[PDB]
Amino acid sequence: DASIDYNNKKSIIKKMYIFRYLTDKQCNLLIEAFRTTRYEEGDYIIQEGEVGSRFYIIKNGEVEIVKNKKRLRTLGKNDYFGERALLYDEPRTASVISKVNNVECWFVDKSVFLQIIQGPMLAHLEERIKMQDTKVEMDELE
Numbered sequence: 236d237a238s239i240d241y242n243n244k245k246s247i248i249k250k251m252y253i254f255r256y257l258t259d260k261q262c263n264l265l266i267e268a269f270r271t272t273r274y275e276e277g278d279y280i281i282q283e284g285e286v287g288s289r290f291y292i293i294k295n296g297e298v299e300i301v302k303n304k305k306r307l308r309t310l311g312k313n314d315y316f317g318e319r320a321l322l323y324d325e326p327r328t329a330s331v332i333s334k335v336n337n338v339e340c341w342f343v344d345k346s347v348f349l350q351i352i353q354g355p356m357l358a359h360l361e362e363r364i365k366m367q368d369t370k371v372e373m374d375e376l377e
């Protein structure tokens with residue numbers, strides 16, 4: 236029963252692109268720590284400017300990223316968000332809005348997030364942030 240849920244969560248995580256660098260211990264912590272929630276269409280999962288404590292992974296549906304009234308992108312299944320506030324100890328840099336009903340996210344707190352990214356995952360997260368900031372900066376020149 237608990238073994239079933241462990242089995243299922245391990246099976247899914249082992250398949251996921253973003254978690255491909257997890258050590259066995261990091262994977263164990265993630266399986267034990269994550270929780271899930273469902274959002275309705277239009278729900279603000281994250282609001283820009285607020286303190287954040289959670290890292291999110293989309294398991295169903297799509298979300299919109301909006302910053303200063305500008306749409307930045309749409310994220311989908313097996314994408315993550317909410318990493319910037321936790322990495323840099325800063326308020327949320329953008330809002331994240333559920334685009335449809337029944338969007339489901341997994342999430343872990345900051346302590347778990349910091350522990351499970353150690354290794355190659357950290358460097359990949361920071362690289363993506365750099366590229367994102369670069370394109371947004373150039374996009375805004377128009």
Ligand SMILES: Nc1nc2c(ncn2[C@@H]2O[C@@H]3COP(=O)(O)O[C@H]3[C@H]2O)c(=O)[nH]1
Pocket residue numbers: 281287300302307308315316317318319320321326327328329330331367368371
């Ligand atoms: N500032 C910013 N955040 C983004 C972008 N794309 C998706 N996001 C996510 O939106 C989130 C806002 O909360 P965080 O700042 O903690 O982390 C952010 C990211 O994970 C982007 O191009 N710029």
